[PDB]
Amino acid sequence: DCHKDEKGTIYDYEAIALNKNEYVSFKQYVGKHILFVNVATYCGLTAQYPELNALQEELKPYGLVVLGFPCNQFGKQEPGDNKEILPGLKYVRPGGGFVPSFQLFEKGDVNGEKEQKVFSFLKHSCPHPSEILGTFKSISWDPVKVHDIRWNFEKFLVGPDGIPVMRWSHRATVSSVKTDILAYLKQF
């Protein structure tokens, strides 16, 4: 008689926090602007972790939540088991006692057949800005799709309604990401 179209949002997904052993529904983050970052410990970009802490500190009052997703698909730069990831950040790289000031989740794929379902959603929702997907070397997964994540520390912004709004290359500095987010927050 009547068809009601049911629409997809970020709140349809969930993941296991690294530091508890407990599932976190993204419904927790209703009304918040969510920054999803795929992370790794042994990347040149790992140096930006304290910049991510600073971003989160600065913009928490504006309703920004940063979420970090370890992934070993990009140069095999997250080799650690889940229990090893936080100790590696604290004592190896960045080292110096570093602890993320935002929520990290269990390690998993962001591309290919076993990719996490939230990343399918994010990737299908927002195109990557570059025509470059990779080098012969960098692509390690199967199948390969035009909206795949290119590398460690790629980023997605999800609005306060759970619909993805924006995506940055891993090549964009955290400072430029902040500047972009600050200009986006002026709407609200």
Could you give the count of Cα atoms lying within 13 Å of 15 in the half-sphere of its Cβ? 24
d(CA 87, CA 95): 9
43 is catalytic: yes
Burial of 21-56, coded b for 16+ CB within 10 Å and e otherwise, reads eeebebeebeebbbbbbbbbbbbebbebbeebbebb
d(CA 48, CA 154): 12
Among 56, 77, 103, 152, binds a second copy (CB under 8 A): 77
By CB under 8 A, is residue 142 in contact with a second copy?
Answer: yes
Q: Closest CB to a second copy among 8 and 134?
A: 134
Among 14, 75, 101, 171, binds a second copy (CB under 8 A): 75
By CB under 8 A, is residue 129 in contact with a second copy?
Answer: no
By CB under 8 A, is residue 6 in contact with a second copy?
Answer: no
**Which residues ranging from 40 to 59 are in contact with a second copy (CB under 8 A)?**
41-42
Q: Closest CB to a second copy among 128 and 155?
A: 128
Cα dihedral value 124, 129, 134, 140, nearest 10: -30
Among 5, 7, 97, 135, binds a second copy (CB under 8 A): 135
- Residues near a second copy (CB under 8 A): 41-42, 75-77, 79-80, 84, 87-88, 90-93, 95, 128, 131-137, 139-147
